[PDB]
Paper text:
The structure of crystals grown at pH 9.0 was solved to 2.8 Å by molecular replacement. A starting hexamer model was constructed by docking the coordinates of the ExbB monomer cut out from the pentamer into a low-resolution cryo-EM map of the hexameric complex. The asymmetric unit in the lattice with space group P21 (Supplementary file 1-Table S1) contains two ExbB hexamers, one disposed upside down with respect to the other, and interacting laterally with each other. The overall hexamer structure resembles a bell with a vertical dimension of ~110 Å and a maximal horizontal dimension on the cytoplasmic side of ~85 Å. A Fourier difference map revealed untraceable masses, probably parts of ExbD TM helices, inside the channel of the hexamer. Low occupancy and possibly flexibility may account for the lack of clarity. The ExbB monomers in the hexamer show similar structures to those in the pentamer (the average RMSD of Cα atoms between two monomers is 1.4 Å), despite the different subunit number. The channel in the hexamer is significantly larger than that in the pentamer. The diameter in the hexamer is ~17 Å and that in the pentamer ~10 Å through the TM region. Neighboring monomers of ExbB in the hexamer and in the pentamer bury approximately the same surface areas (3000 Å2) and the residues contributing to interactions are also similar. It is not obvious why hexamers crystallized at pH 9.0, but the negatively charged amino acids in the acidic cluster at the cytoplasmic end are further apart in the hexamer, and the channel radius is particularly large here. In the crystal, each ExbB subunit is settled on a flat plane parallel to the membrane and well follows the six-fold symmetry normal to this plane.
Author numbering:
A (entry chain C): 10 to 232
B (entry chain D): 19 to 233
C (entry chain E): 11 to 232
D (entry chain F): 19 to 234
E (entry chain A): 10 to 234
F (entry chain B): 20 to 234
The structure:
Amino acid sequence: LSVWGMYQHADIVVKCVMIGLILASVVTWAIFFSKSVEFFNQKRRLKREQQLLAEARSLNQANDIAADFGSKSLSLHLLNEAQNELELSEGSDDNEGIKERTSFRLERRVAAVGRQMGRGNGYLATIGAISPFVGLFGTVWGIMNSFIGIAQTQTTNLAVVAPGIAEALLATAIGLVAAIPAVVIYNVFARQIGGFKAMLGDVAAQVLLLQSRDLDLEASAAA
Amino acid sequence: ADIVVKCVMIGLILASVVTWAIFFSKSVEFFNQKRRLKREQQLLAEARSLNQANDIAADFGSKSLSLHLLNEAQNELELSEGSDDNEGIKERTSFRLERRVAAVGRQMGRGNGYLATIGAISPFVGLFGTVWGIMNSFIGIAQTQTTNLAVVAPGIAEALLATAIGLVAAIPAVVIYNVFARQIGGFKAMLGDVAAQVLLLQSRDLDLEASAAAH
Amino acid sequence: SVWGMYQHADIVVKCVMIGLILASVVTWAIFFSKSVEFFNQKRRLKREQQLLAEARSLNQANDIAADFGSKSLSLHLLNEAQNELELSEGSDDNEGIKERTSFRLERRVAAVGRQMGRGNGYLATIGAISPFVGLFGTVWGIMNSFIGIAQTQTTNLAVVAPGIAEALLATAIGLVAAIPAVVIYNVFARQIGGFKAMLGDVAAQVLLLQSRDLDLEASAAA
Amino acid sequence: ADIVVKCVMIGLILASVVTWAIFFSKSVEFFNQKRRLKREQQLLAEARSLNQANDIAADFGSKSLSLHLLNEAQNELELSEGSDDNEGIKERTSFRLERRVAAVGRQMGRGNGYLATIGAISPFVGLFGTVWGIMNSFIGIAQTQTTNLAVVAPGIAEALLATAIGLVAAIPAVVIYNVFARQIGGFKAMLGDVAAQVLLLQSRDLDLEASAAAHP
Amino acid sequence: LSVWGMYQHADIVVKCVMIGLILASVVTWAIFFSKSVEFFNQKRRLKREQQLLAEARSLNQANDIAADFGSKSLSLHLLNEAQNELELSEGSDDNEGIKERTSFRLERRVAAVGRQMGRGNGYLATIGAISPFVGLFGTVWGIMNSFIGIAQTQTTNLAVVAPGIAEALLATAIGLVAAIPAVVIYNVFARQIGGFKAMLGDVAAQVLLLQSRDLDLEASAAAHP
Amino acid sequence: DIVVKCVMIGLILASVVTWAIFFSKSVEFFNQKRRLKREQQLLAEARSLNQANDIAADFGSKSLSLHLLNEAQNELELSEGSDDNEGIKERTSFRLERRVAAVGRQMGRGNGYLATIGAISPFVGLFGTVWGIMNSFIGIAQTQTTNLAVVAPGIAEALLATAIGLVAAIPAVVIYNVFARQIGGFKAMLGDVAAQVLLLQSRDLDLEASAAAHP
């Protein structure tokens, strides 16, 4: 017997748990292949940018390195945040206020990127968490049909009870196929987002160190 | 057939009706308030001063959240008119904005409590119906001195149906609760970023004003 | 009937049943008394918060709150701020007054939250142990089905039925006692948290008025 | 009879005796300490200065917790006699009082470790006796080649009794552990509020003293 | 009938589950007896040291009390940390920097001691975590052999399935004997390490209070006669 | 069965991945651990940051203690000409703590696979069992058998898939826990070395500032 052969011999209820769980599995692997390529390219880009910006000895030197990073560059967004804060604060005597406002902006920015990074993880979490609930529904539906079988035939043996038990076991099998990959993929991506946020945080830390040092050397020259 | 099992089933159907009713009313409330705030955040991002932010937000509407946060900062500056302590103004403004963002989040969640309880207890009220059903089938066996399972099979199948309905009421309530909980958290974070911009504009304005007075 | 079931059951299952029904009576008694208590308190604080939102100084806030009642929570927080200013009369450190007032108000709001919680401890224990006393009844019930087999020397559906029906009854009563207690405990825990947040917002307003007043007074001297 | 199973039931009965023994001793000490601290907190709430608080707390016992906290603040002021840094006195006092409140909370917890273990393992030692009992009934069936369940029903019923006793030992230990854990938490909060009052009085007194010296 | 008698009648697979779980239980109780005595002696020493150092009115007085505490005394290590900080900082005008550097050193030291106390708990955690899996494996294997029994012997009755069921139950019983004590002992030690860290933290707090007060009184004597 | 055969192959390939991480992390910890204890011991008798750089001169280019000292020296070099000593101390501690965190992250590489293999291997085993027993019941339905003996070899074979699943999971769980403990202990030691680099720099700056105030 084939999986399409099993589908045909199952009742309308278990046919729907099958359709719904296979569609849940198709969406799990579709999210997986699109997000895996998205993270790979983005980590490769940020790792190169982090290495190049590590050579900067001033915020101005960092802006020169990042000049040809691209409009959609994350390191260039963080540097533009620090430059916009110095431009708007042009004419202020409080250097500590510039540093505090820049760190506030960069940390909120890094958080916002982390939120964008997981637009599909919500689907992976729900699929992994509810797939066993629907498998259990098919399990109870399955055994209920075994008892309907006993009532209808007024007989209690393996053969009368087998169609309902096989149907119950099918719902558990499909439930495990949908749930296990969604749980694994959700956790791998949640770990990758956390590791990416930490790397982007190290780049924003460098933008902050360069700005803080530059302001201190300027304040020393005024004193 | 059983009055207790009948009550479990009508209770679960009512739980499902309430789940979808909460879903349709809250979905329209979120979609509108989440889209409006994203537009307001984009427009206010262009502001170079708190006065410029008030000009952008002039035509935002009376029920605008961004306009409430800007009015909080303006009320603080008006009441503090005549104070030498600029940090005292900044601290009082951040305290006010923090507390309002929190208060809005508390209001955004109203209706999520019902979804959580429906999703969590529905399988157990379902289980109660089947335990009760099978209990009565076994009271029946004792009373009649029955030996044949075929005589109790209709009662057992009917009892197991209560667990199936329980799981059908629970699954949508769990999914809908999690979608909304994620949306509320993401909205609180966005409203948090708008309040942060109101604070940055006020803090920078006070510093530039103090620098102009010193020289 | 439920009384008919009670009569046919063991002395052990009869005790588990009466203990769980009494646990359910206490759950709903706590529920009706605390629901009215929280509603009236939330209703009173929302009105007080709206009226005190109009205050432009701590003195104005004291005038608005004058007729709030002896048992008013907003009036207690305003009296905390006033007692701090009175005891600190003659101090040059305004920041010390602000710090001591915020320390007092936050500890006060915490203490009120603890006072709201009285009764929830019973709801938590009922909701948490009811499934375990239900499990005991199940184990006891199945044990009696095996005693039945030993006594009659026969394995049969009829022989084990009294033990199985008893076992199922203990699980049913356990679920009736546990489910409401768990729900009601969580509703109240959320309501206490929401009320503490509300009382915190009123304590925040008392602090803003005192902080602003001290700053404007210091500016007038300079 | 079964030795391993009889050992599990005597072990569970002894576990029940120790949960009620811990319960009666602890209930007596806790009630006595909570009752005393509530009275002390009410009396010390009237104090307008640290000196006034020491006068109110004179009529308190040697084993009084409120008097220990007040003695901590006074020992800090005595040892710091001759220091210009008032902020250093305040910081050292708050450090001492918070560590003291934490240490008292830890002392209150003595015995609760036993109420946690009994309530957590009792269902599992119960389960072990059941598994062991049923295992031996099946060893018996294998060795004698029986097919009648009636022959092993007394052994199976005896084995399931070990899970029932397990649950009877666990339920009171779990409840009593949670009531005491809640009481310790509520007591720590109250002792914290008394230490907070000792700190407010000392902080205010130092500030008013510094203000009186600035304006002679 | 006896535990060795059951071992002999069981499968080579059930024999392996049994020996692996019994060895896991031997190591659980061996760790338990060695750590319980080394923990008792250390807490007894620190409680005496805490009582004696509570009498100190200056950091110099604390060093005199702790002079004869012993080479591996924990209270003496904390006092040596404070003294080494004052010696290395000799010639510094920033007293706040001395206080900050000393608290940094003492908190890192208290953390390092807590990590040393934790030696062996890693084994208790792994035994608690893997024992239910190896017990489950024996149960699955046992029930599998009951089905092999139904297939091999033409018949399906209590006697045919009894050897497989008895084996399955044995694996669950041993699994519970290995797992439950390892989980309990791991949690008792984790609570005891936490309580010890808190007591050692109270001793380090006293070292810090004495140093902070001493520096403040010294600075006050330099400012005003 | 082809489905049950695939879970065995999957479970074998899962054991291959377990041996891979077992071998990479074995070599990375034997070679990087004990070296740190030696470096920390030598750095402990330092007195000055300059003295620490002399001790660490012959530590090796790939030394972690030498990387932390180079971080403190690069901060002093880039900050040459700054009056704010507190800003140098703050920037150095920020750099070192982010560096220690980054090393901890690099050390965890592979443990994610050990955790998932150990946690998920019993479930792919369970799937094979459920699938096997399902086909035995399809067989009973198709033939109308009433004898458990004809369907016992298939059930015993299906239960074998859970046994193999547990045999694959147990080594991954053990190895994951040993490595998790080793990483944590190493992070703690590297943290203590970075703490020493910070204490030396902080003390040096304070003694330098005191020498300038009263020459």
